[PDB]
Write a protein that binds this ligand. Structure first.
Ligand code: SZ1
Ligand code: CA
Length: 223
């Protein structure tokens, strides 16, 4: 997260770290046994880490649970990044409490202008590289479809939205991939892609979760 702030330990209880020997992506806990992330985060040997603040220190609220299965969206295209969503099932159900909690799926899509909370352990620099270890947060508005399409000609599908600031300075970045965009208590977005981080006229692009609620529920119901 570039241009954000320190969330505070366990203040974002649905935020997970995906670990394969190291943090490589964020995710969102959506029930006791399932996490939503980005398809571009797919890899084998995933351990889901819940209740994290400092990802390099065991602080006492963590639950580490190995993934039993990963399900990338059937129509994920790794070239265009269309349908950038994946589900991860935990080998065992997490113990839900005030610091490890699920986030609600949307019942309706969010509109341009809605303020959202974006979070993660990614790079905090727009040019250099610095990784923070504690969870960072950013409040950002959803941008209009027209401004999003104008920012990225020929690249924005109906399954993507832009959020952030056209002036630059505030954005999600490398390592925030797969993490939450939460607006009014609903998971509306997944950190997906962009051209660099926090660059002028290049806001972050996010997977439009409201398009996938039916798929998420049917998939969970049968797996
Ligand atoms: N806003 C994006 C975050 C996902 C990873 C690519 C960098 C830019
Ligand atoms: Ca920790």
């Amino acid at each position: 997260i570039v241009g954000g702030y320190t969330c505070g330990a366990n203040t974002v209880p649905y935020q997970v770290s995906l670990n394969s020997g190291y943090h490589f992506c964020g995710g969102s806990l959506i029930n006791s046994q399932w996490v939503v992330s980005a398809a571009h985060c797919y890899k084998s040997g995933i351990q889901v880490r819940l209740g994290e603040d400092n990802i390099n220190v065991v602080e006492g609220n963590e639950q580490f649970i190995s993934a039993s299965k990963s399900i990338v969206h059937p129509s994920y295209n790794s070239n265009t990044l269309n349908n950038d969503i994946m589900l991860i099932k935990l080998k065992s159900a997490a113990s839900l409490n005030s610091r490890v909690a699920s986030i609600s799926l949307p019942t309706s899509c969010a509109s341009a202008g809605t303020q959202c909370l974006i979070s993660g352990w990614g790079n905090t620099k727009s040019s250099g590289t610095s990784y923070p270890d504690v969870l960072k947060c950013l409040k950002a508005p959803i941008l209009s479809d027209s401004s999003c399409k104008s920012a990225y000609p020929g690249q924005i599908t109906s399954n993507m939205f832009c959020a952030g600031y056209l002036e630059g300075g505030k954005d999600s970045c490398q390592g925030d991939s797969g993490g939450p965009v939460v607006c009014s208590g609903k998971l509306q977005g997944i950190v997906s892609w962009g051209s660099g981080c926090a660059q002028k006229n290049k806001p972050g692009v996010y997977t439009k979760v409201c398009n996938y609620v039916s798929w998420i529920k049917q998939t969970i119901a049968s797996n």
